[PDB]
Symmetry: none
Subunit: 238 residues, 4 copies
């Protein structure tokens, strides 16, 4: 294998219950020849991805942690959200999504799709339930800043009258959800709720399901999941 | 300019403010030739260390995060503890350590030593058993009665001059440590040094021990107070929102 | 008054202590200063309902039912017992008001309130119970409840109970988030416009189980009271 | 119903999730007429068994807590120990006991006997001599050297066919028990069943003995382990409050 693939295999011999190892134990646990193992370990120690600890064994290095922390804002949210999204999938059996607002555009970070989903997945801020929910919680400037500019009816059901949007956004803000019938397919609706962290809306959790399906049960499931994401983000320490 | 050194330089072009870049921009910022950059970035995408979006751009990937989470308790503790450990060093001017308990073994995560330290640390590679350090005793004191009695059914070698070995003495010592919030270990690592440890909590659970090593005759209680203040600082910072 | 069944039952229980675990029915007459005939009646009824226990050897002891009855309110009772000396220390230093409170069914129950004679600020003179968003204590407790519980509370109207009471749900989310990270909250003007309230959490086994709070003049420095309350809170935690 | 039974019924309307009640609520839950609930509650308040809460309602009083605590040494241990003793009963199906030292004699705080128990357990008339039970010998092993020597200063009676009386044999017995963490022999009184005892600790000190009685033919070692696990469980529960 490439150097990098071997490095990853070495890293995957470590776990929360196995902090410190010898290079030989690494070799066995990664199924790497002893001499390859020692060489790969030594290169990893040189660049600080591993460190040689107080006990003579190697352990994961501070530099790996520091490097990973450079993406913590998106990566930690994604990693914490995913178990809650799985739970949503088990109950709804359609599609669940996680989204954030980045440079006044909606960036979808994760989507799950159930093999039995009836609805189908397919973008500007006004053209998804997620974007609408996020827009509803953005600053007053960002609302105006986006409403003045172009609002194409991107799908069949896409609301794009500046004044229809103000009422839609204001209701979403009060109610803690927004629905978006026919925004992607006329036969499908999108439902989004906010995810809070430290008092601010940082993301939106959404479902796509058939238009005819009841909306309120999905709002409840998404809320519960959004509450769980917040709890785990807030309570987690590492 | 090894493969791994190159991978690291690519990762370091990212930061809290730069979350998405093209392979070209990465080549410039990491001083890589653009052919090398495209190849390196592509290999990192292939193992999941980077993720390439639909619109061409590359971001730090879930697999990097998940690999770091294989040691995230130890690593984050070290990071948060270090500034508090440095302040202990300025005031006490001996040694300050951080340790955790893994499968009833004591792992030391950091050991700082002041250039003017009178006491001496063991500088040989190895691992003391759980009963043979102040950190081990503090950690054992919070491990619960089941773990205690397991340890006390097993061999208790008298490793150093001061090492307490009598099962009943150890039960009293551990109970006292639990109530008092510190343990002292006079003469365990050398005859002329004492170890002093306090607990570090997260969410009510004792997850580590902060310790000093200092000369045998130095007063224990002034050092305990310093360690306690540092432990409070560590506990407080561990619950800061932004990592 | 001294002559009811209950008053006599209590006087009997008080003859027992850590050293006097086992007595006789007549020796209880002696130490409680009751006539033996009336003593043997009260004991027998106490033994019947299980407040005392007696073996074949005549010996009477405090019974398991007494213990189980007391346990029905143990957290609150034990917390008060432990907290009181630390609160008196706060009273000496701040010379205003110190309170201890718990959350039950998302309502704040004040368990203890000490007011110093020279206190410049005034406590609330509302007879019934303030809601959870209407005191520093309720804010501190709510900050440690689930986001679930937070969003339940914030889904209902929040009256402006005092001059300064924050009722805006977004301002509340920000206030609560900050309180959670900082380990205290302030509630300026919640009782009177010239006073504030400050609370810190009390933990047991990792869970915030109560709030220790002050009321003091609005103009006074906040941070010194926060530290005093913090020292008291740590003392209370040690002792539990 | 008597005054004291009503008082008790009032106390039983409280619980860990209901600490403050109106007297009318108390009447509802205790099945008392409104007039009766009021006067029962009022007198309970008057003597401090209840307290009238800071915001109007009634709650369990500090006085009740202080009264309960006068026997917490026995009562808390018993309350905490009982579920672990029931788990021993389920696995061994004989007899489990809980004992402490009172005035240098063995006081049994709890005894459980299983219906299907093969062995027979002697009916106990008060406290037993400290040297005449496995529980006694286990507690004595962890008492002071002062306590040990006081017991051994006076010649000891042969209370049963199993009783050891010789001071030197007792010293060896006690040293072995202290070191091994159990006493196991024929019953030191009847000696037709095996009495087994292990220490229960709290905060570094042996506070009680957990014991079994079982037939002479049964293996000792598995019952020692089961009792040890229970003793560790009891200690654990005492430390988590």
């Amino acid at each position: 294998d490439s150097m990098l693939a071997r490095v990853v295999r070495v890293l995957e011999t470590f776990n929360v219950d196995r902090t410190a190892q010898t290079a030989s134990d690494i070799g066995r646990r990664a199924a790497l020849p002893s001499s390859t193992a020692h060489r790969v370990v030594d290169e990893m120690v040189l660049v600080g991805i591993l460190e040689r600890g107080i006990d003579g064994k190697v352990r994961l290095g501070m530099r790996l942690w520091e490097l990973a922390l450079r993406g913590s804002m998106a990566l930690r949210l994604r990693q914490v959200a995913l178990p809650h999204m799985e739970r949503v999938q088990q109950r709804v059996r359609e599609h669940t999504q996680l989204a954030v607002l980045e440079h006044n555009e909606v960036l979808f970070l994760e989507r799950l799709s159930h093999h039995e989903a009836v609805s189908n997945l397919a973008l500007p801020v006004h053209a998804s339930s997620s974007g609408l929910m996020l827009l509803a919680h953005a600053g007053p400037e960002v609302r105006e800043e986006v409403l003045s500019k172009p609002l194409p009816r991107v799908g069949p059901g896409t609301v794009t009258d500046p004044e229809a949007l103000r009422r839609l956004l204001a209701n979403a803000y009060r109610a803690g959800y927004v629905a978006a019938p026919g925004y992607i397919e006329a036969v499908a609706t999108g439902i989004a709720v906010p995810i809070r962290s430290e008092g601010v809306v940082i993301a939106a959790l959404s479902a796509v399901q058939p238009l005819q399906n009841a909306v309120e049960p999905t709002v409840e499931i998404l809320r519960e999941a959004a509450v769980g994401i917040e709890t785990d983000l807030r309570a987690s320490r590492w």
